[model samples]
Target: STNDNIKDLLDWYSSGSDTFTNSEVLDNSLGSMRIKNTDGSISLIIFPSPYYSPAFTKGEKVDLNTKRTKKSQHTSEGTYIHFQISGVTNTEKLPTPIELPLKVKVHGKDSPLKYWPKFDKKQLAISTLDFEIRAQLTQIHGLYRSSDKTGGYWKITMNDGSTYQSDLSKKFEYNTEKPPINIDEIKTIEAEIN
Candidate 1:
């Protein structure tokens, strides 16, 4: 049943004619991607590190699947737990779905933990737990455009509802033309313990 979570999640994201864009995955840190749904709701899927090779090209259309569970662990501070989501990505251009594993972690502080005792180590295990994510794009700010007119910097909202601004030092080439990207897009995807 431990393996069922990933399979179930993959199903939810791949269920409809919904497509994904603005996909970006990091190597050993955090990454995010956007899901364009048929319902007009856009979801931002954020994942943590240990992300395997074959980084996604920005704004690619692809479907996702799970390979297997690799590992899980908690931070010493008990603030969060890190676990792997071994994934395979399928695209029309590719001959086969490529393996791209990553981590999804949850975090909280002591003050909040008092009310949420279920987050305690003894009561919670990565295998027995499930995920419920809701995110919105509340804001977007353009920093600068590239000298070659290829890409630019942007400050956008993250899955946690906080704004993440790109560094002016690094330019990002997205599928969209310039700034004034759509905002206030939201989506709710579910994962249940099986």
Candidate 2:
């Protein structure tokens, strides 16, 4: 059933292989798209490019093509798919055409529509704020020494009350004046866990 749902969601966008016409650009970042279907409508909100402005203004209708880069997978957060903006029509009409090969990440948690059929009801119950809190590390409780005293680990907590213990390594010395850890280090460690 999960496979079927994933397939349906992927196919909903024509597997990112065909150009969609008259699709309304829904945001300034050019990451939100609204495509009309005979029965209903679907929305695609991709992760926007940083430091790049869209050539087209919001609410404009344009023809666009996308390429699904890999198979969609479910994460602890939710299902996500990576895709690229392969082509855009009528670029000459605009001051500048959208950059090609633009990387985009679409997460089920960010979908406003029930495009992920299997997760339609479940996703609706969980808001984006809730999802972010669950996925992000909120605090580092502290570093504690292992009984062996050869290494130490950091106890971290998330907003959802979930706790994680970092791997015990010789590099860590517990209760020291200066722990070999920083916000960036913790973030990198957390990312590796996910």
Candidate 3:
């Protein structure tokens, strides 16, 4: 039987869709981000949620003690963590979960996104990210990250695990630009959409 978390996570990551949908993130989360489109609307998501520096030390086990928060408008839309939802600073005790939540759970996937944003090709790197995420179409392919916590970003982690982040895509219009970096040596895709 298979039993390694890393292996399991990597397997889970591999079996995912190469595309994304807006309804999945139709609504936004507190931590949602956006990329402006030519028409002025934008694109966004709350996945990867926030990353909390877990209480565990290098040697200790992660207690995985469940934590909850004041239910925000987004909860019914869906749930997220690692950090609190984007704009919710209430710090209020969360209304009890339907059950003791797991270290990971489908309850989260069910949460609605903050909003469905719109972004153009130029903004794709930062807005759509370098990954092949589906929000209506399989937008791009690969993985990426922004610079600052909310600042603009467009990065890629090829199938080979090589890394790249480009600020070039930001300089041109969505239609006429190609990012500064795109490691094409890797053909097999590997990663989680979020």
Candidate 4:
């Protein structure tokens, strides 16, 4: 099974606990893992391997230290914190690792992939052009205002309008410069292109 192969990869870096192999790395799509915690919570653990979050796509980079957490646990720079959730119900049970997809969407719109007219796709025929566009994707991470419960949410979306939401998960603020992360602040104007 793929899990056996994946586990063998895990063991290559860590004998067992929270560790990753350090070597020739792939794109941010490599590792996106979730673990059930001892407190009946689930953790979405992201590694520090140059991965990007799709949630912050439509928006640009916000100030990392603007809304600093008062009780900020000093973590080394250039790292990610393991997400720990609390009081998760049994219905949302953790699935088998092998069933999980091995891809992470770490690019923004107009970066990797974009829509084109009927034969417009034919104009840009070279596969190398697609790879070049994909490489230009802006890579960044969304750090929540507070690491603890702060009555907020981190909502991510896809081009297909599929949405993913998490509670108290990001820095929620509305500004003319940056697009809103909250429902109230986001614009809903629609357009059609030929």
Best of the candidates, lDDT: 2
Q: Taking the tens digit of each residue's C-alpha lDDT, what string does model 2 give over 1-194?
A: 22343333223322224334465654444543333322223334342333222355666665543443455344565434333332333312333322211111122122121221111111110112112211221111111211222122234433455443433232111122111111111221121111
Cα RMSD to the true fold for all candidates = 22.0, 19.7, 20.1, 20.6
Number of clashes found in candidate 3: 29
Provide the clashing-pair count of each candidate structure.
0, 0, 29, 1
lDDT of 3 at 102: 10
Q: Relative to the true structure, how large is the alpha-carbon lDDT of every model?
A: 0.26, 0.29, 0.25, 0.23
Give the alpha carbon lDDT tens digit for every residue of 74-106 in model 3. 334353323221111111222332221111111
Q: In candidate 4, how many Å is residue 183 off? A: 21
After superposition, candidate 4 runs with Cα above 4 Å error: 1-149, 169-194
Question: Any residue pairs clashing in model 2, and if so which?
Answer: none
Cα lDDT of candidate 2 equals 0.29
Residue 105 miss distance in model 1 (angstroms) = 31
* Among all candidates shown, the one with the greatest TM-score: 2
Residue 150 miss distance in model 3 (angstroms): 31
Task: Tell me how candidate 3 scores on lDDT.
Answer: 0.25
lDDT of 4 by residue, 1-194 (tens): 22343333222212212211111111223333343323333234332222222132211221110111122222465333344111111121123211211122322212122322111111111111211222121111111111221122233343456543332221111111121122222222111111
lDDT of 4: 0.23
Q: Which clashing pairs does model 1 show?
A: none
